[PDB]
């Protein structure tokens, strides 16, 4: 609705930023409201659903196990890493660093997981094939947060993102079962999801993942609806921006209470 072009502009002026935003029809694709929908953001922990995505992928072609135990050093441990620093004696399976990476935005998960599906340049391949011609992963973590005004590194677009969590989420590319899987990590994120569903009326279904970086860049994609079955896809992302978090905060929910309203 447009209404809500009115919120997204007002946080482009309040932030002080760019914001990319886009509504797309669950069902068929069809693009309901966008705004920069084709400029690129830094994807920040949003890729790790992508990442998962290729994993699962893997394990459909019988490449990978999701109950594959992961061993690794206390050197391999980057920053942000509160599920893999308690399993240095341990190791972790694949299953529970999707787990980690996705409900928890564990970076160390993350950095293991592109080693077993081959990095930054497989994840892209595997995009590119599934027909995103514009996502692209370059870096590991934590450098691929490094939001470099107008570098193109590790970033996507509004309408790249969209239409790829679609094609994830319900097209062939993926097993029922590994959709489903990619799907219960996404309802199980820790980090913003308690959020969403705090402010959402009971009953709705709420799917995300979001990633801050640096340069005040953030940003979310979710799958939602009412009454426990997603219908829409929304992506934002925002870079540049000074604001104070809370700041930031409250432009998202500014953003988020009109795409409620005019659902
Ligand atoms: Cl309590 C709280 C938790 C998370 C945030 C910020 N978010 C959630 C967020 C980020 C971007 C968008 Cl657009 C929406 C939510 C974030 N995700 N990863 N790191 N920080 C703010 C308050
Ligand atoms: Cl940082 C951040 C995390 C979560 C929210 C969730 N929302 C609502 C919301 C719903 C859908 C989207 Cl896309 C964005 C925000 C909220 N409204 N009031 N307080 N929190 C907002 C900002």
Redesign the pocket.
């Given at each position: 609705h447009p209404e809500t072009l009115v919120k997204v502009k007002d946080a482009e002026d309040q932030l002080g930023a760019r914001v990319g935003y886009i509504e797309l029809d669950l069902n068929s694709g069809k693009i309901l409201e966008s705004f920069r929908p084709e400029e690129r953001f830094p994807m920040m922990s949003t890729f790790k659903v992508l990442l998962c995505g290729a994993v699962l992928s893997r394990v459909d072609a019988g490449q990978e196990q999701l109950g594959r135990r992961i061993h690794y050093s206390q050197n391999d441990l980057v920053e942000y890493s509160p599920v893999t620093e308690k399993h240095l004696t341990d190791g972790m399976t694949v299953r529970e660093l999707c787990s980690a990476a996705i409900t928890m935005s564990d970076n160390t998960a993350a950095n293991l997981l592109l080693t077993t599906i081959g990095g930054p340049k497989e994840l892209t391949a595997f995009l590119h094939n599934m027909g995103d011609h514009v996502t692209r992963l370059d870096r590991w973590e934590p450098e691929l947060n490094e939001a470099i005004p107008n570098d193109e590194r590790d970033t996507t677009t509004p309408a790249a993102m969209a239409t790829t969590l679609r094609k994830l989420l319900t097209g062939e590319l993926l097993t029922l079962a590994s959709r489903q899987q990619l799907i219960d990590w996404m309802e199980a994120d820790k980090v913003?999801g308690p959020?969403?569903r705090?402010?959402?009326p009971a009953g709705w279904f709420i799917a995300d993942k979001?990633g801050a970086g640096e340069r005040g860049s953030?940003g979310?994609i979710?799958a939602?609806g009412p009454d426990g079955k997603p219908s829409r896809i929304?992506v934002?992302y925002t870079t540049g921006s000074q604001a104070t978090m809370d700041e930031?905060?409250?432009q998202?929910?500014e953003?988020?209470?009109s795409?409620?309203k005019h659902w």
């Open positions: 913003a959020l969403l705090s402010a959402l979001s953030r979310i979710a939602l929304v934002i930031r905060n409250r998202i929910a953003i988020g209470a795409l409620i």
